[PDB]
Amino acid sequence: ANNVLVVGGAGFIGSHTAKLLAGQGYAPVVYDNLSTGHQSAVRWGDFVEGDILDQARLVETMEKYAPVAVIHFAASAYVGESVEDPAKYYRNNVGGTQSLLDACRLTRTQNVIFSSSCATYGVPSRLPIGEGEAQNPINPYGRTKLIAEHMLADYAVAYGLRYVALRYFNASGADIDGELGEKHDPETHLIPRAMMAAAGRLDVLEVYGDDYETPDGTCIRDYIHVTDLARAHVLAVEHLKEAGGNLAVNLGTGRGTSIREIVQSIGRLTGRSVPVAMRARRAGDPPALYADPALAAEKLGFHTVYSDLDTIIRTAAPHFGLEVR
Template sequence: MAIMVTGGAGYIGSHTVAELLARGEEVVVVDNLQQGHRQAVLGGKLYEGDLRDQVFLDKVFQENKIEAVIHFAANSLVGESMKLPGKYYHNNVYGTLCLLEKMNEYGVGKIVFSSTAATYGEPENVPIQETDRTLPTNAYGETKLAMEKMMKWFDTAHGIKYVSLRYFNAAGAHESGKIGEDHNPETHLIPLILQVPLGQRSHITVFGNDYATSDGTCVRDYIHVSDLADAHVLAVEKLRRGEDSGIYNLGSGNGFSVNEVIEVARQVTGHPIPAVMEQRRAGDPAVLIASSERARAELGWQPKRDKLENIIASAWAWHQANPHGYAKA
């Protein structure tokens, strides 16, 4: 029996595929390669296609005995979602509907969903708890919340059990050095910082230094991508045990300010990395940290790579070896 990984050629998806393969699992990767990279898929069977294509999905389900699905496939840029909400509803929500309907048709009753802590919106508690209100402040978070709610009703109606994992900032690269983070456009802080010592930008921009934090810059939760991959595999195991559906936050338990991340990157790379201060961006909360106590207790999740120095060092090693991402010079 195989595990289908949608979006398995993407950043977190490819690391989860690598973890599944390391555990001897049969893996089927489904990706339209809109954002993913064929080179990031280290094994298994890769099907290039879109979840909204019914004929394509029939082919995948008919050619493989699928036991469970890990669902990463989604557009995920907050700014773009505010300009093009229709794109996000069509790809994220409708794509998930197509997937769930095919799962029901072919009798696949387990799905692990890569969600986001953006479902909470402005936090009412720090760290954020799973029981906190969900009030997204952008279309991206709203579509992810809609996807979660859809899974709830497919569970109620059809018994498709789900685990939804909510988290903020994935970072780092695989210990093998074979896969890492390559987005276009790049919006994540750590790879943007590393573009400075790579000679691809002159400085890193810091948006605001007047927040109510220790150094005035925003504080965020960073998780090594391989620790996130572990959590998704543990969620599959939970469903294999016949346990009920659930929602879990994933977090390192530690927040780091933008200035702290830049300083650690200076130490890791040995580069000065100039920082230029600009005005705050609209909608940036001061502190975003998620509590992972429930995931630790119920999934048995224990992050092993949670030191910021290790996260950045792994990212730096990959970017040095792949300064233009998966594109070959």
């Protein structure tokens, strides 16, 4: 009994996690509807094509595989889209998660690792952001992630569900061995966009603000290597497996990275410059956002190992038509 159900396991972070699980002796079973993920990324165990809203098929799957844990990545998201199409996010992130959690309790499938987001915090009072920070999200994406977190808490109370919610800002980089990458269309994440622009796959990288109250002048955000993310989700499995209590922790390096730093590194490491177009800063935009990683260190024994900028850039670059030298 070493099956682990990786819901959303055909996508960016899910496929890396499936690879890691297999490396640690688990048998990842991917359940994915391929809406944004890729069947070719399911290389480390069985594949079940299915939607998490297809509750009968999800229950059927849990009964067949009797997974010792469920890792939930199955929520697609484009940067900025939730404000214009909140219906999609309430349906998938709230409706879909409820269907998953119902499938779990109805099959006595017990351990749920939920991939959440630091977007749940919204604009913070203190940097870095600690788990105690109020969660006042500013868009439906953040809102629906927060709803899922609370749903987990209510299902724990009612049904004895055990869980770990993992919060982080920006998944980045790719597997060190170069055969598994981030394949999104449209690609809305910053480092892929910057690399695509340097590679000539995009014409321009529009950067909104050289004006921020930071060094650089450009905004600071929080980037974690996807392999580090995989590591944490598996540690979370081990935590619940060794009878750990329910957790909600931040994942990251504890240090932010500016846009200038990223563009600089890409140019330096690849020899291709990023064609930046500086546009006016947005009025209510935060200058710096990054999470405090200490609770995850204490509770999970987790530290990032691959989330230096150099490793993030180096591993991602080949997947976007760039060459590292």
